[PDB]
Amino acid sequence: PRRRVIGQRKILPDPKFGSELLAKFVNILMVDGKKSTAESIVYSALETLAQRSGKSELEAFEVALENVRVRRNALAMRWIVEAARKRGDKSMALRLANELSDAAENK
Amino acid sequence: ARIAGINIPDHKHAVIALTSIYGVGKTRSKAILAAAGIAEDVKISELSEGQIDTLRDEVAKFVVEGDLRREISMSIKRLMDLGCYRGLRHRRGLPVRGQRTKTNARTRKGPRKP
Amino acid sequence: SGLGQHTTTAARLYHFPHGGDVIDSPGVREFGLWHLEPEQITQGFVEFHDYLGLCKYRDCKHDTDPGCAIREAVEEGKIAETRFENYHRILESMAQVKTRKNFS
Amino acid sequence: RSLKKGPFIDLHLLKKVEKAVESGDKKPLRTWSRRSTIFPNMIGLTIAVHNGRQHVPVFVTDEMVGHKLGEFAPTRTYR
RNA sequence: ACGACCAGGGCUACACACGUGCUACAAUGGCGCAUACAAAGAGAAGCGACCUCGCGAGAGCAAGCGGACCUCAUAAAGUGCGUCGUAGUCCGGAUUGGAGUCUGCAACUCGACUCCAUGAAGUCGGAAUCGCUAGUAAUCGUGGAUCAGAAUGCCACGGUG
Ligand SMILES: Nc1nc2c(ncn2[C@@H]2O[C@H](COP(=O)(O)OP(=O)(O)NP(=O)(O)O)[C@@H](O)[C@H]2O)c(=O)[nH]1
Ligand SMILES: [Mg+2]
Ligand SMILES: [Mg+2]
Ligand SMILES: [Mg+2]
Ligand SMILES: [Zn+2]
């Protein structure tokens, strides 16, 4: 970093929606290299956000992303995941869905 | 519902509620429900009194009560009153079956004090 | 004016009228604590022997650590606070004497 | 611990039991077999069990049957 | 005799201190059923299938194979369904008792493993301190050396990432 000035890696996007930004979101929640169990929680959390908390699933995540703002998007997604773990609900898909609901209404 | 195991099981599933009796784990609770004919996911609700007393008879083969406390205790009293080496381990609160006593003996020794 | 002078030399030997000897000392303002570890500083005080092993952690600096039972004994009043504040002055002196190096 | 096909006992100590039954009880018998399984024909005898430097006599009791002679002799002195 | 032989004991002790690890404190999980995908090695005083018995550790019977053939050897995470619903719990497994397997002249001091039962502390850890810039970190299992037997250590190997 003192001499070695290089860029940052560009991972493959979301296979479901074609979103580059959502591919970085599932990697933060992913622990122990478990991609298969991480993306199932994120997909089920957004479907709760889409069907019962407002349409335009890709736009509904962006409104929740906008209030908590490369590094600006990185710190915003990290604050959602880490605050979702310390909640009172039952599952990780239910906790992160309520965090995106609160971030959409900036509270 | 009061069993011969007088301590009242919690109002939950059958294989979990039988575990609260001293001397019935997870495996033995499965053996009683298999011998009686009651499913393991049946709660205390709808478990009729004709289905509770048939669990009293199946558990009656095993002594699982404060009477089981004294039988474990007097088995240790057989060791300590005899004067054996293993009986000396129980009287001071030291590990018996080969655990070291340099460090990491906190369960047997009790909390630390210099 | 407000100080003391060390006129008499190192040590002169005499005898008691009953028995034993006397040894005079110089006027000394020196503190050599290069001997051993700060674990031995904990052993250098009498009443602090009986209060070891009572704090939260097994290792403790006893100044900025939460739950120090030795600090609770000073706050209770069984240990005077003059001795406690001077105790960490000994520990902060070892942050100032040790600086260059010295070894025997 | 040990398998059920035959409880182990040393041959020299088994000979010491047989003469003790016929000729009656004697002075406490010094031995080194800390690994022998106690049989019911030994009840009443006093066997001196070696523990590293000395021999400690052990009066055999009825409920000692099945145990080892090494379970009655501490090998270290603690203070 | 500072030599040598043998028996037993000690190297594994216990009021404590320190460094190094494993498993945890859990719903990104626990358990039950169903089920998919590895690479790299080891094997003749050895690996030991199939069949049969035991809840199980295993045992009996008994081939194949000095081996790209046969055996260890069904990889585990994952996937699908059901369950528990945030608690000292169907978390976590310590400790202890009882009943046993196998190794070996011989498992008390001091072995491994299975079964039943018991269910400590612990609900994410102060000052301080370490590793790591990519198939890396993290995590999942497998194999080997040592070895009659005795791996949370070490050496390798892949899976996901
Ligand atoms: N008023 C009074 N003066 C005293 C007393 N004891 C000593 N002094 C005085 O104090 C002074 C110092 O005494 P001194 O014994 O020489 O001190 P020191 O510690 O030996 N000095 P040094 O360090 O040179 O050896 C002397 O002038 C002495 O007379 C006392 O009880 N009362
Ligand atoms: Mg029970
Ligand atoms: Mg558990
Ligand atoms: Mg580098
Ligand atoms: Zn303290």
XYZ file of C-alpha atoms (C1' of nucleotides) and ligand atoms in Angstrom:
601
model
C 0.000 0.000 0.000
C 2.990 2.286 0.560
C 4.325 1.402 -2.904
C 1.867 -1.243 -4.138
C -1.040 0.884 -5.334
C -3.535 -1.565 -6.842
C -7.278 -1.657 -7.388
C -9.919 -3.763 -5.682
C -11.424 -6.999 -6.992
C -14.654 -7.016 -9.015
C -16.717 -10.038 -8.003
C -19.402 -11.610 -10.180
C -22.860 -10.094 -9.614
C -26.092 -11.565 -8.216
C -27.206 -14.482 -10.437
C -30.857 -13.890 -9.512
C -31.247 -10.161 -10.239
C -28.073 -9.181 -12.087
C -27.076 -6.725 -9.346
C -23.405 -6.010 -8.659
C -24.202 -4.246 -5.377
C -26.249 -7.134 -3.958
C -23.334 -9.525 -4.546
C -21.259 -7.561 -2.025
C -24.172 -7.631 0.442
C -24.396 -11.426 0.728
C -20.648 -11.734 1.345
C -20.855 -9.642 4.523
C -23.528 -11.893 6.042
C -21.656 -14.983 4.808
C -19.601 -16.642 7.535
C -17.406 -19.779 7.260
C -17.672 -19.633 3.469
C -21.359 -20.624 3.497
C -22.680 -18.982 0.331
C -25.671 -21.330 0.010
C -27.108 -20.486 3.432
C -26.267 -16.767 3.196
C -28.093 -15.950 -0.048
C -31.199 -17.886 1.038
C -31.527 -15.600 4.067
C -30.975 -12.447 1.983
C -33.484 -13.517 -0.693
C -36.128 -14.395 1.910
C -35.535 -11.098 3.731
C -36.037 -9.044 0.560
C -39.182 -10.989 -0.399
C -40.613 -10.070 2.999
C -39.586 -6.484 2.211
C -41.113 -6.667 -1.273
C -44.500 -8.276 -0.717
C -45.530 -6.836 2.672
C -43.351 -3.739 2.952
C -43.486 -2.050 -0.447
C -43.028 -3.052 -4.117
C -39.946 -2.476 -6.348
C -37.616 -4.874 -4.484
C -34.498 -3.485 -6.186
C -35.587 0.088 -5.412
C -36.784 -0.738 -1.881
C -33.282 -1.862 -0.914
C -31.855 1.333 -2.428
C -34.051 3.640 -0.311
C -32.912 1.697 2.758
C -29.350 2.001 1.438
C -29.580 5.757 0.810
C -30.435 6.842 4.370
C -27.492 4.995 5.970
C -24.815 6.355 3.597
C -17.460 2.216 -3.143
C -16.568 2.588 0.531
C -19.750 4.622 1.084
C -21.797 1.649 -0.119
C -19.528 -0.756 1.786
C -19.935 0.861 5.213
C -23.675 1.276 4.614
C -24.261 -2.434 3.964
C -22.043 -3.420 6.901
C -24.059 -1.291 9.343
C -27.283 -3.026 8.267
C -25.969 -6.577 8.734
C -24.205 -5.994 12.067
C -27.216 -4.225 13.589
C -29.536 -6.987 12.345
C -27.726 -9.658 14.388
C -28.416 -7.925 17.733
C -32.223 -7.901 17.506
C -35.097 -9.657 19.247
C -36.798 -11.459 16.365
C -36.531 -15.141 15.566
C -34.543 -15.661 12.342
C -31.931 -13.728 10.388
C -34.322 -13.228 7.463
C -36.884 -11.636 9.786
C -34.320 -9.421 11.546
C -32.682 -8.017 8.404
C -36.079 -7.357 6.799
C -37.086 -5.123 9.713
C -33.724 -3.322 9.519
C -34.327 -2.461 5.862
C -37.830 -1.338 6.832
C -36.379 0.979 9.483
C -33.646 2.209 7.131
C -36.254 3.026 4.479
C -38.091 5.161 7.055
C -34.701 6.504 8.394
C -35.081 5.344 12.005
C -50.264 -34.498 35.715
C -48.302 -35.918 38.659
C -46.181 -38.989 37.953
C -44.534 -41.307 40.487
C -41.832 -38.835 39.529
C -43.692 -36.243 41.674
C -41.901 -33.231 40.136
C -44.269 -31.890 37.500
C -43.123 -32.004 33.857
C -43.487 -28.827 31.797
C -46.469 -28.377 29.452
C -44.562 -29.205 26.239
C -43.745 -32.184 23.987
C -43.627 -35.633 25.561
C -39.990 -36.611 24.964
C -38.798 -33.257 26.341
C -41.082 -33.260 29.403
C -39.947 -36.721 30.535
C -36.316 -35.539 30.562
C -36.943 -33.320 33.621
C -37.243 -36.407 35.833
C -33.893 -37.251 37.461
C -32.634 -40.381 35.700
C -34.422 -40.086 32.318
C -32.375 -38.582 29.491
C -33.200 -38.320 25.814
C -32.671 -41.989 24.918
C -34.623 -43.489 27.840
C -37.514 -41.088 27.179
C -37.693 -42.456 23.628
C -37.825 -46.018 24.978
C -40.810 -45.297 27.240
C -42.833 -43.587 24.500
C -42.062 -46.410 22.062
C -43.122 -49.085 24.559
C -46.321 -47.241 25.541
C -47.509 -46.145 22.101
C -47.467 -42.358 22.403
C -45.900 -40.144 19.755
C -42.989 -37.981 20.879
C -44.437 -34.709 19.529
C -47.694 -34.980 21.514
C -48.025 -32.273 24.147
C -49.435 -32.519 27.662
C -52.653 -31.200 26.132
C -54.815 -34.125 24.835
C -52.551 -36.483 26.833
C -55.401 -38.069 28.777
C -55.167 -39.617 32.238
C -55.433 -43.068 30.671
C -52.277 -42.157 28.751
C -50.403 -40.746 31.760
C -50.805 -43.744 34.081
C -49.530 -46.099 31.368
C -46.388 -43.950 31.400
C -46.277 -44.369 35.186
C -46.094 -48.153 34.789
C -43.357 -48.084 32.142
C -41.174 -45.777 34.248
C -41.891 -47.961 37.322
C -39.298 -50.513 36.168
C -36.508 -48.000 36.803
C -35.850 -46.259 40.105
C -35.766 -42.571 39.144
C -36.301 -40.307 42.173
C -34.479 -39.208 45.354
C -34.207 -42.966 45.885
C -31.911 -42.877 42.842
C -29.928 -40.064 44.507
C -29.093 -42.262 47.502
C -28.199 -45.270 45.333
C -25.610 -43.210 43.468
C -24.478 -41.733 46.795
C -24.240 -45.014 48.732
C -22.282 -46.515 45.836
C -19.728 -43.784 46.555
C -20.115 -44.515 50.290
C -19.056 -48.087 49.494
C -15.802 -46.626 48.160
C -15.101 -44.103 50.926
C -15.919 -46.357 53.889
C -13.773 -49.142 52.423
C -10.607 -47.038 52.478
C -9.657 -47.625 48.845
C -7.616 -45.309 46.630
C -10.691 -44.303 44.626
C -12.514 -43.568 47.877
C -9.796 -41.092 48.833
C -10.391 -39.190 45.587
C -14.052 -38.453 46.349
C -13.468 -37.251 49.928
C -11.095 -34.416 48.937
C -12.850 -33.546 45.672
C -10.148 -34.701 43.235
C -10.602 -36.267 39.769
C -10.728 -40.044 39.705
C -10.443 -41.584 36.244
C -7.080 -40.145 35.173
C -7.549 -36.379 34.787
C -4.482 -34.287 35.611
C -4.247 -32.028 38.661
C -1.544 -29.587 37.492
C -4.077 -27.183 35.963
C -7.610 -27.353 34.509
C -9.222 -29.176 37.446
C -11.753 -26.453 38.200
C -14.835 -28.701 38.267
C -13.450 -31.020 40.956
C -11.544 -28.466 43.049
C -14.095 -25.651 43.133
C -13.402 -21.924 42.550
C -9.870 -20.562 42.783
C -8.297 -18.971 45.859
C -4.541 -18.517 46.545
C 17.769 26.397 54.342
C 15.177 23.647 53.882
C 17.296 20.562 53.199
C 19.577 18.075 54.920
C 23.280 17.349 54.577
C 25.000 13.950 54.640
C 28.244 14.535 56.544
C 28.882 11.130 58.149
C 30.364 8.468 55.844
C 29.108 4.989 54.871
C 29.159 2.749 57.961
C 31.064 2.724 61.258
C 30.833 -0.323 63.514
C 30.371 -0.314 67.293
C 28.880 -2.530 70.002
C 25.879 -2.405 72.310
C 26.380 -2.472 76.090
C 24.107 -5.549 76.094
C 24.936 -7.281 72.810
C 24.957 -6.861 69.051
C 26.383 -4.217 66.754
C 25.301 -0.976 65.102
C 25.725 0.019 61.457
C 25.356 3.656 60.446
C 23.928 4.494 57.026
C 24.730 7.285 54.554
C 22.329 10.021 53.678
C 20.774 8.145 50.768
C 18.257 9.427 48.230
C 18.333 6.544 45.730
C 15.891 3.826 44.683
C 17.228 0.785 42.860
C 14.319 -1.334 41.627
C 16.238 -3.134 38.847
C 16.128 -6.398 40.817
C 13.035 -8.398 39.872
C 9.652 -8.383 38.142
C 6.677 -6.226 39.239
C 5.131 -9.439 40.621
C 7.629 -9.002 43.466
C 6.335 -5.452 43.988
C 2.994 -7.025 44.954
C 4.831 -9.120 47.555
C 6.675 -6.085 48.958
C 3.710 -4.989 51.109
C 2.266 -6.881 54.074
C -1.502 -6.304 54.009
C -1.684 -6.707 50.223
C -0.726 -10.386 50.621
C -4.137 -11.244 52.094
C -6.044 -9.507 49.266
C -4.422 -11.192 46.257
C -6.494 -13.604 44.200
C -9.701 -11.689 44.938
C -9.986 -9.480 41.841
C -11.767 -10.265 38.579
C -8.941 -11.300 36.257
C -5.972 -13.551 36.998
C -3.630 -10.759 35.845
C -4.315 -7.164 36.837
C -2.488 -3.825 36.712
C -4.856 -2.637 39.521
C -4.944 0.942 38.171
C -7.117 1.022 35.018
C -8.616 -2.472 35.297
C -12.352 -2.858 36.068
C -13.263 -4.824 39.175
C -10.072 -4.562 41.218
C -10.752 -5.975 44.686
C -7.570 -4.326 45.992
C -8.988 -0.976 44.855
C -12.256 -1.955 46.564
C -10.315 -2.442 49.809
C -8.909 1.089 49.523
C -12.337 2.557 48.720
C -13.786 0.717 51.729
C -11.205 2.360 53.991
C -9.368 -0.686 55.344
C -6.364 0.438 53.264
C -5.426 4.120 53.328
C -5.409 5.937 49.991
C -1.955 7.419 50.658
C -0.452 3.945 50.317
C -2.505 3.126 47.209
C -1.594 6.276 45.269
C 2.057 5.782 46.200
C 1.797 2.139 45.081
C 1.078 3.078 41.468
C 3.716 5.796 41.731
C 6.143 2.888 42.182
C 4.718 1.272 39.037
C 4.912 4.525 37.074
C 8.480 4.991 38.318
C 9.349 1.684 36.615
C 8.036 3.256 33.403
C 10.685 5.979 33.865
C 13.728 4.231 35.365
C 13.724 1.288 32.910
C 14.055 3.602 29.847
C 17.670 3.343 28.666
C 18.706 -0.087 30.052
C 20.575 -1.522 33.058
C 21.616 -5.090 33.897
C 24.057 -6.546 36.414
C -12.477 -51.997 31.587
C -11.062 -55.478 31.053
C -12.820 -57.944 28.764
C -15.097 -60.532 30.360
C -13.181 -63.595 29.062
C -11.168 -64.337 32.179
C -10.350 -62.072 35.121
C -6.594 -61.592 35.345
C -4.526 -62.703 38.333
C -0.805 -63.422 38.572
C 0.390 -67.009 38.918
C 2.653 -66.403 41.920
C -0.078 -64.722 43.978
C -2.611 -67.443 43.115
C -0.196 -69.971 44.624
C 0.023 -67.815 47.761
C -3.766 -67.995 48.177
C -3.937 -71.809 47.917
C -1.444 -72.481 50.712
C -3.153 -69.820 52.838
C -6.546 -71.564 52.681
C -5.238 -75.015 53.626
C -2.639 -74.056 56.246
C -4.794 -71.333 57.805
C -4.179 -67.600 58.071
C -0.604 -66.369 58.542
C 1.492 -63.188 58.892
C 0.606 -60.541 56.236
C 1.811 -61.722 52.845
C 4.246 -59.431 51.019
C 3.646 -59.207 47.271
C 4.070 -56.905 44.279
C 0.949 -57.807 42.261
C -0.957 -54.508 42.133
C -2.858 -55.738 39.047
C -4.582 -58.866 40.395
C -8.364 -59.160 40.573
C -9.666 -60.035 44.041
C -11.466 -63.417 44.140
C -13.878 -64.589 46.892
C -11.365 -67.186 48.165
C -9.197 -64.333 49.532
C -11.740 -62.916 52.026
C -10.229 -62.789 55.504
C -6.564 -62.776 54.554
C -4.168 -59.848 55.011
C -2.074 -59.117 51.909
C 0.798 -56.622 52.143
C 0.517 -54.538 48.972
C 3.722 -52.949 47.681
C 3.366 -49.226 46.937
C 6.815 -48.209 45.676
C 8.971 -48.409 48.785
C 7.084 -50.384 51.465
C 4.329 -52.984 51.864
C 0.952 -51.922 53.286
C -1.213 -54.749 54.718
C -4.804 -54.823 53.446
C -7.444 -56.822 55.323
C -9.617 -58.277 52.563
C -13.323 -57.474 52.909
C -16.326 -59.123 51.196
C -17.094 -56.089 49.003
C -13.460 -55.929 47.815
C -14.132 -58.836 45.419
C -13.656 -57.687 41.833
C -11.347 -54.775 42.627
C -7.566 -54.583 42.298
C -4.949 -54.644 45.037
C -3.425 -51.481 43.564
C -6.618 -49.607 44.495
C -5.685 -49.882 48.197
C -2.093 -48.548 48.189
C -1.255 -44.869 47.659
C 2.044 -44.561 45.810
C 2.952 -40.999 46.880
C 2.991 -39.107 50.184
C 1.208 -35.735 50.075
C 1.604 -32.835 52.516
C 30.879 -48.505 40.942
C 28.895 -42.514 38.296
C 28.643 -49.589 35.763
C 25.039 -53.657 35.017
C 20.261 -56.944 35.953
C 15.150 -57.272 37.700
C 10.429 -56.021 40.399
C 7.380 -51.937 41.620
C 6.779 -46.670 41.676
C 7.807 -41.792 39.383
C 8.070 -38.961 34.716
C 0.632 -38.032 34.620
C 1.593 -35.218 41.891
C -1.343 -30.042 43.574
C -2.531 -24.818 47.561
C -0.858 -21.636 42.477
C 1.472 -18.835 38.152
C 2.531 -18.373 32.603
C 2.531 -19.553 27.380
C 0.337 -22.545 23.548
C -4.637 -25.302 21.586
C -9.587 -27.609 21.268
C -14.920 -27.285 22.227
C -18.428 -23.634 23.500
C -21.685 -19.630 24.921
C -26.254 -21.242 19.648
C -31.593 -20.044 15.382
C -25.841 -18.173 9.543
C -28.049 -22.914 15.046
C -29.710 -27.906 17.592
C -32.087 -32.639 16.329
C -34.595 -36.453 13.105
C -35.277 -38.473 8.168
C -33.986 -38.465 2.955
C -29.769 -37.388 -0.190
C -25.456 -35.141 -3.833
C -20.282 -33.802 -4.832
C -13.676 -34.591 -3.118
C -8.433 -34.776 -3.580
C -4.147 -37.097 -1.497
C -2.130 -41.455 0.826
C -1.794 -46.324 3.524
C -1.832 -51.837 3.358
C 1.248 -58.503 4.109
C 3.325 -60.670 11.862
C -0.961 -55.853 7.036
C -5.639 -53.428 4.934
C -9.455 -56.755 5.798
C -15.031 -56.820 1.922
C -19.518 -59.751 1.724
C -22.698 -62.420 5.179
C -24.464 -62.925 10.456
C -25.133 -61.014 15.630
C -25.131 -56.850 19.203
C -28.607 -50.147 20.597
C -23.405 -49.410 20.086
C -17.828 -49.716 20.726
C -17.316 -54.510 18.115
C -17.490 -59.849 17.496
C -17.996 -64.360 14.491
C -17.584 -66.352 9.599
C -14.682 -65.347 5.438
C -13.035 -63.501 0.074
C -10.081 -60.046 -2.695
C -5.277 -57.678 -2.595
C 2.114 -56.553 -2.388
C -2.173 -53.760 -5.277
C -5.063 -47.282 -11.350
C -8.016 -54.230 -9.893
C -8.976 -55.486 -3.549
C -9.522 -53.144 1.343
C -9.339 -48.942 4.793
C -13.749 -45.857 2.487
C -20.602 -44.322 3.365
C -15.996 -37.491 2.931
C -18.046 -33.560 5.931
C -20.129 -28.925 5.326
C -24.333 -28.386 1.703
C -29.409 -29.677 -0.280
C -34.962 -31.137 0.737
C -38.773 -31.728 4.567
C -40.336 -31.700 9.646
C -39.320 -29.960 14.574
C -37.758 -26.774 18.594
C -39.232 -20.046 19.002
C -34.653 -16.702 21.935
C -34.483 -19.441 27.325
C -29.014 -21.154 30.824
C -33.021 -23.708 26.315
C -34.091 -30.093 22.416
C -27.806 -24.388 23.573
C -23.176 -26.094 25.405
C -20.950 -30.500 26.904
C -17.539 -30.563 31.701
C -17.553 -33.711 35.995
C -19.217 -38.211 38.366
C -21.614 -43.066 38.872
C -23.190 -47.716 36.684
C -22.643 -51.294 32.712
C -19.075 -52.841 28.636
C -15.746 -53.195 23.915
C -10.723 -53.492 22.039
C -5.283 -53.293 22.322
C -1.381 -55.910 25.229
C 2.376 -60.607 30.135
C -0.771 -56.981 32.177
C -5.319 -51.123 31.365
C -5.408 -49.366 39.886
C -1.820 -45.572 40.027
C -2.076 -43.652 34.098
C -5.153 -45.977 27.748
C -8.669 -45.498 23.817
C -13.799 -46.057 22.656
C -19.151 -47.258 23.235
C -23.929 -47.430 26.076
C -27.194 -45.600 30.141
C -27.709 -41.650 33.598
C -25.859 -36.962 35.727
C -25.859 -31.811 32.951
C -20.150 -27.437 36.140
C -18.734 -22.826 34.391
C -20.406 -20.225 30.244
C -25.454 -15.901 27.434
C -19.310 -13.181 23.037
C -14.979 -11.968 27.156
C -10.818 -5.710 30.625
C -5.953 -3.627 30.015
C -3.117 -5.919 26.608
C -1.953 -8.797 22.252
C -1.695 -12.006 17.283
C -2.525 -13.859 12.242
C -3.753 -12.450 7.213
C -3.997 -8.516 0.769
C -6.982 -14.041 -2.607
C -8.309 -19.339 -3.716
C -5.762 -15.921 1.148
C -8.559 -15.402 5.846
C -12.503 -18.102 7.950
C -14.623 -22.939 8.229
C -15.668 -28.271 6.783
C -14.039 -33.135 6.816
C -10.121 -36.797 5.032
C -5.209 -39.085 5.154
C -0.216 -39.969 6.916
C 4.230 -40.140 10.078
C 5.092 -41.718 15.456
C 2.410 -46.316 17.251
C 0.870 -53.460 20.235
C -2.543 -49.805 21.886
C -2.806 -44.623 23.121
C -3.794 -37.215 18.601
C -7.542 -31.083 20.926
C -0.318 -31.819 18.643
C 2.302 -32.015 13.990
C 2.692 -33.101 8.716
C -0.100 -33.181 4.124
C -4.797 -33.220 1.192
C -9.220 -31.266 -0.832
C -14.707 -28.986 -0.270
C -17.091 -24.249 0.255
C -15.223 -19.355 0.159
N 15.862 19.472 68.547
C 16.409 18.294 68.218
N 17.476 18.261 67.429
C 17.894 16.994 67.204
C 17.358 15.819 67.683
N 18.078 14.726 67.222
C 19.015 15.252 66.486
N 18.969 16.621 66.429
C 19.881 17.487 65.693
O 19.709 17.232 64.315
C 20.965 17.404 63.614
C 21.229 16.209 62.712
O 21.777 15.140 63.462
P 22.686 14.042 62.793
O 22.553 12.885 63.703
O 24.024 14.650 62.607
O 22.053 13.700 61.448
P 22.540 12.583 60.530
O 21.314 11.949 60.002
O 23.474 11.733 61.300
N 23.349 13.261 59.344
P 24.202 12.484 58.251
O 23.243 12.156 57.132
O 25.364 13.370 57.875
O 24.846 11.282 58.890
C 22.017 17.661 64.691
O 22.315 19.049 64.744
C 21.345 17.185 65.978
O 21.789 17.889 67.122
C 16.224 15.868 68.526
O 15.611 14.926 69.047
N 15.805 17.177 68.747
Mg -33.835 -36.668 33.264
Mg -26.827 -30.432 24.231
Mg 2.089 -9.258 1.335
Zn -7.279 -5.901 40.644
